Amino acid sequence: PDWGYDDKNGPEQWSKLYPIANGNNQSPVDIKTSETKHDTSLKPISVSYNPATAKEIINVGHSFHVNFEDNDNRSVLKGGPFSDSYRLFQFHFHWGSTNEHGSEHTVDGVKYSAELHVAHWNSAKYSSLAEAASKADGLAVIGVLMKVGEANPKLQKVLDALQAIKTKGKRAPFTNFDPSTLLPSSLDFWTYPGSLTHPPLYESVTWIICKESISVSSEQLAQFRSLLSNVEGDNAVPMQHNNRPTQPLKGRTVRASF
Ligand SMILES: COC(=O)c1cc(S(N)(=O)=O)c(Cl)cc1S(=O)(=O)c1ccccc1
Ligand SMILES: [Zn+2]
């Protein structure tokens, strides 16, 4: 692809090929808690996932993705700022080259060591991800900040699966998994209108950022970094990082559910 995370094709150069990188609705952002506004219309988040929708784990070169069956509404996100249910599509992570900064979002300028994204599309209004993905109301992503510390045993199915998808394009079945198990105990959240965090950078995402973090150990993060961006047979190139810097708020308000 024409983009990545290296100095030659990374975030600071994505605007040349994707000019919306310099848009007014870009993600991630720093959440300044003193500036958030409470919206009394927000409802709690409700996640209702069916573990039989887990389908496949895929090495996509710059990251890896756990896909869910995309056929019906068996797994949905509801509540929060939404009127419509959104259909679970995938989850994935971002991480950094150091434990010091691997998240995408930051809170009061604090950088976490990784971030979980649980992505959904608006199957009430639209009929495919392809149709929804460029629409302002098309996508919803739950972000969870991951604080380095004790090993998180909830990650073990995912981490154990990585040995079968070492290089770019490899994939393997990944079944019987409810990714709400990866979320924090409480689903208190912030929300703002933003974008996918890598190309094509569409401004189509309602972000739901959990207030509570989850843990991850330094060795678990090293397992992400040990994934390889090259194809099989080519000299091994580790996926050392895949987190975008925070982007200007440009007048948006971050709403708080608490
Ligand atoms: C390869 O794409 C992704 O993995 C991804 C990542 C994000 S992220 N990182 O912003 O959560 C979103 Cl919202 C959504 C997507 S995605 O919906 O799967 C996507 C894919 C191709 C084009 C348009 C949208
Ligand atoms: Zn992401």
Author numbering: 3 to 260
Sentences from the paper on this structure:
The carbonic anhydrase (CA) family (CA, EC 4.2.1.1), consisting of twelve catalytically active human isozymes, performs the catalysis of reversible hydration of CO2 into bicarbonate and acid protons. Since it has been observed that CAIX isozyme is highly overexpressed in numerous cancers, it has been postulated that compounds inhibiting CAIX may possess the anticancer activity and may be used in tumor treatment. Here we have designed a series of compounds, methyl 5-sulfamoyl-benzoates, which bear a primary sulfonamide group, a well-known marker of CA inhibitors, and determined their affinities for all twelve CA isozymes. Eight crystal structures of CA complexes with compounds are presented in this study: 9a bound to CAI and CAII, 3b, 3d, 5b, and 9a bound to CAXII, 3b bound to CAIX and mimic-CAIX (mutant of CAII containing amino acids in the active site as in CAIX: A65S, N67Q, I91L, F130V, V134L, and L203A).
The structure of 9a was also determined in the active site of CAI and compared with the positions determined in CAII and CAXII. In this case, the results were somewhat inconclusive because two alternative positions of the compound were found in CAI. One position is partially similar to the positions determined in CAII and CAXII, and the alternative is rotated. The 9a is unlikely to occupy a well-defined position and had a weak binding to CAI (ΔGintr = −48.1 kJ/mol). Still, it showed a significant change in the enthalpy of binding (ΔHintr = −39.7 kJ/mol).
